[PDB]
Amino acid sequence: SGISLDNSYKMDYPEMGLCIIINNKNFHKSTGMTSRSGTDVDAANLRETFRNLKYEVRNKNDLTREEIVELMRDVSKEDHSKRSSFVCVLLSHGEEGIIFGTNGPVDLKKITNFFRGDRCRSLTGKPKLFIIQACRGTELDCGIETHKIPVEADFLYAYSTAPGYYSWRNSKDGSWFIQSLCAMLKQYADKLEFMHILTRVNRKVATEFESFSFDATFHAKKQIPCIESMLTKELYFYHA
């Protein structure tokens, strides 16, 4: 055969893979956490968007910390041999390195470790994408007027916000990040490599959104998403 190159992940397996969407809206009163109005818009938008990309979407709502772990554990024990990749979207409250279950926090590392190259052999060498809409702290951006592989390899963390910062969600239109992500995926999934699509998402969130609040502390704030890539190849959602 002619000359071959291996710069992009093989995405022509029989199935694109699973897209797990965890949507936490209602939290146990004892946690003292507010409901996340608008998150359902995000969940439906993501379901439709990934359905169009040919992913097997599974939506889960209001899962406890224990349920999140067991779900991730069970999913990682499935046979992904015939799947090209894996996607997990987390919509909830959070802080740096933490996602919140309805009854308490969950370490992100605990969730992702189940998919390590040595713990999920059917996903070894395949892109594992974690999309996270949740706060990573309490900082506010005031803006300015213009043959072995690593077990941590092949992971991509698409964070809605910069390390240490709050993440914004509109109770009517949904989160800034998820709204933008779905829009960019719908428009460029057939045209651009994933990192370039995410860069477009960064630009959209950074330029088209600004908070409005009667509280001066939270008014006129900006946001920049954060792409954290440990991928080893280019990722295209199309093939052939």
Binding site: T34, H93, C135, Y166, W168, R169, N170, S171, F218
Partner: peptide, 4 residues
Amino acid sequence: DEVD
């Protein structure tokens, strides 16, 4: 607009 609200925070997560």
